[model samples]
Target: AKGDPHVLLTTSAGNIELELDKQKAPVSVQNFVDYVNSGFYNNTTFHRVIPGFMIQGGGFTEQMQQKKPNPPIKNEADNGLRNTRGTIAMARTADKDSATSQFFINVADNAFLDHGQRDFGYAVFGKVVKGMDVADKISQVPTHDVGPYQNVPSKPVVILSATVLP
Candidate 1:
């Protein structure tokens, strides 16, 4: 049921459970939950990684082909949440409200990514309640640019499945 709002993300590295904050980030939470329900994250690889930063996924295939997402969601970075370690935030382009299915787990506290009066930041809707080690392991993988996409893992870190936990 979406009532519980907790998701168990099973990846090749390990299982990461995230407790989505529906109260604080209703739109983003529902968007993520919808993806999980549709089995949209299965077999997708963590396409971007940065050491001392975060690992991102939910939008690419094993061959590194980009999947077309539904639509962009609004920026909810001002929802009193910070991009702290173990937290998950939407990944977007320079446009503040461009977030879609792609999200990242913050391996380090990145205060600069938080919203301010001047900057419209990435919307953070959940955090890793389990498998921080898996996120850490993914962060350390070797990466190189594949054509235009940078920071892609030399070997794909696959998300086997994503399920909503009742």
Candidate 2:
């Protein structure tokens, strides 16, 4: 199944090849694939990167400001997926089903991130099957506290390019 639909996302460091688990997370997977296929994630930057935590992106302005997301997604958090290192998953607001294009990767196993009393964990759709070293580099980028947030990279890291590779 290596021929499966995959995305070759690029950053200043290098490229990462991700494989979406369409079966366990169809909606989220399709949402991501469509975004990639339509170039919605191209040139988009990784706005938030928390060392030993996660790297979040897919919704931000060139100046590192939040942008409105299309719509919320159904809570597929309890999809029997675990947020392991190098794994890719959706990022949402307090609402269980608010994820759209924005996703994050667990630099560590953030199992405690699950919503209180809710099985609504992050929907892990894929992982950095390749170029994990590049991902590791992004993880170590010097981060700083911004306006009202910590863990924001002092120097914003851009996605540069994202595309669906056959």
Candidate 3:
């Protein structure tokens, strides 16, 4: 139940398949897989979307309530992964190792987000190997401020389910 790591995310916008790199980012991959197997992402919304940037989700309800995630894992940005288009990365706070269940998919080549020689950067653990257009569609959705949050999609884009695929 821990090793066949590809995940399928069925959302209101569409479905996405993510091929996780276990060797490159074991901790992040394991954390994501655990969430998927537990249905942690079910009915969660893509709470943030920046047209040229990335779409972030996996930790918020349609009501904007943040879901509690497990304790943070170490930053794996130094694992030779780059934040290129379609690559999935862990979403963290200013603190490098603060990533929990939140993650994002780069819609464009965000080279500046790479770790380079710095100690803190978003850890890229996977890439969208299938249904990339789903992410693109989500990126193109109309976004506006919701309460204190900007880039909130005008219409909720919900993740109906997230599962580990064979």
Candidate 4:
């Protein structure tokens, strides 16, 4: 088996299996694993989807209500991973090290968001190992503004469950 740990996200769109680079981003991996293990991601919706950009989730519900999450984790963008297509990165606010529960999968190469390229960019902790088609499909869904949030899928793409493979 690869040294990287794997997780499966069963969603309304489809399943997305991720390979987390635990060696390169231990803090990010641990933070994600804790959420998966605690069932915190269950029923959460992939609230943001901008075609040709990224698909984001793990914080908000279908109603656009953000769920309570654990404290923020440190930024690991310096781990040397790029925000390339299929790579899963932590979704953070403008503040570095402010990533809590939200995560995103880049649909295009986003090198500008990598470390040093934009001053401590987002942490790319994992990649889509399988079911990338599912993510691709989710990306192309019809999106519209929901209140203040932009590019939310008109029909929610919910995470039915998140599981770490044994």
Candidate 5:
């Protein structure tokens, strides 16, 4: 409980290690840890690869199937964490509390996503401590639009596994 929690995502693109700021974003960090410990992110794909935005994954399968996630978590955007480059944040819908298992790694500075800036912004729970280049590589991957979805990675960047580190 002293140090921040860490998690390692073993993806097809490469390995990425994350550090969760439990003190700042408690709810989102706990929910993310729950999903990682439950093996919920295995076999998922980084479907959204918006170059100047963020690379999102952990809710869709390699076959473009949507995996059911746990109940949505509260939007704790007031935690003071900014959605800056290399930070990890929950990927939610228009609803503020709709964040589930899907998460995104910011590839560029996104101050507009801060809490009071955009009407309750996305919750930033963590940052990439190691292997951050993996997120960049994933961000630059070739992408194509699907039937109704945009920015889907053409080659299906898969999440082989996500493990909680001690």
Candidate 6:
């Protein structure tokens, strides 16, 4: 089954099928898959939404707080995975080693992040294969700074559910 390995991440907006490039970014894909396999993304909320930029989630609980993350894997940004719309990428803190479960979908071309930023750039290992309209709907959700962060939606966008497609 060529598509059995696909990952389906569902949000209030809709379902996004991410075809993980395990051949190119093994660690990144594994980290994400492992999280999904463990149901870490279930009932999570899309907490960050920046219009015309990106929508970020997959590591927070229902309270809109950051959940404890597993140890981060390697920085696979150098794997040549470009940040195009619908591409799935890991969201890391300022410290490159701190990435655990946070990820975002690029609503547009974010290639500028890959030029020389290197590790500063997000690690893209997959792209949306279906349910992009859901992604688009999630992108337009009303957003503002919750406390000290930018592009945070006022009410958390409930993930509703996240299931790995096979």
Please report the candidate that would top TM-score against the real structure: 4
User: In candidate 6, how many Å is residue 60 off?
Assistant: 1.3
The window of 10 residues in a row where model 2 has the poorest summed lDDT is 113-122
Question: What lDDT score belongs to each candidate, Candidate 1 first?
Answer: 0.89, 0.76, 0.87, 0.90, 0.87, 0.76
Evaluation by lDDT, superior candidate among 2 and 4: 4
Ranked by TM-score, the better of candidates 4 and 5 is 4
Highest lDDT scorer: 4
Please report how far candidate 1 places residue 42 from its true position, in Å: 0.8
Off by over 4 Å in 5: 1-3, 146-148
Q: Point out the worst 10-residue segment of candidate 4 by lDDT.
A: 143-152
TM per prediction: 0.94, 0.89, 0.93, 0.94, 0.94, 0.89
Clashing pairs in 5: none
Q: Write the per-residue lDDT of candidate 3 for residues 1-166, one digit (tens) a residue.
A: 1124799999998899989999989999998999899888998989889888889999998787889888898999988899999899999898998999999999999998899666567899989988888898998898776576668888868999998987
| lDDT tens per residue, model 4, 32-96 | 99999999999999888888888999998877898999999999999889999999999999899
Can you write out model 6's per-residue Cα lDDT over 1-166, one digit (the tens) per residue?
Answer: 0122588776665667778888777888888888888888888888887777777898777787777778887777777778888788888878765678888888887887562544457678888888777777888877774466656677777876666764
RMSD of each: 2.5, 2.3, 2.6, 1.8, 2.0, 2.5
- What is the Cα-based TM-score of model 4? 0.94
lDDT of 4: 0.90
TM-score for candidate 2, please give it.
0.89
C-alpha lDDT of candidate 2 relative to the true structure = 0.76
Better of 2 and 3 by TM-score: 3
Alpha-carbon lDDT of model 3: 0.87
lDDT at position 131, candidate 5: 80
The regions of model 3 sitting more than 4 angstroms off are 1-4, 145-148
